[PDB]
């Protein structure tokens, strides 16, 4: 069986242009566990990116949190790019300050 990941991009604390925060990309509800996630800044990959240890929910679907320290601005564009076997092309989700 194969389940495609649900993807959420958001910050640890409310976004304030100029104040340091944490950009989060949380992927869940997927199977199998192999997945590739990138946090993007104006199309470029961010190198200092960590993630939580592999785990899964009561229904057996996996979930992982990828995060990085960052400082929002009005011009900068942030996003999460995810690839999994259920996806033909990497999926790109743009950070929405209100979501």
């Amino acid at each position: 069986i194969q389940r495609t990941p649900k993807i959420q991009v958001y910050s640890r604390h409310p976004a304030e242009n100029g104040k340091s925060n944490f950009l989060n990309c949380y992927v869940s509800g997927f199977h199998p566990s192999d997945i590739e996630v990138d946090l993007l800044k104006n199309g470029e990959r961010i190198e200092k990116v960590e993630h939580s240890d592999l785990s899964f929910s009561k229904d057996w679907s996996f979930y992982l949190l990828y995060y990085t320290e960052f400082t929002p601005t009005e011009k900068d564009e942030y996003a999460c790019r995810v690839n999994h076997v259920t996806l033909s092309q990497p999926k790109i989700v743009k950070w929405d300050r209100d979501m």
């Binding site: 640890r12 944490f22 939580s52 995060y67």
Partner: peptide, 15 residues
């Protein structure tokens, strides 16, 4: 409804 998500400081968020 979005799925409850970890903030990274031990806490969670949802809307």
């Amino acid at each position: 409804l979005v799925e409850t998500r970890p903030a990274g400081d031990r806490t969670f968020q949802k809307w």
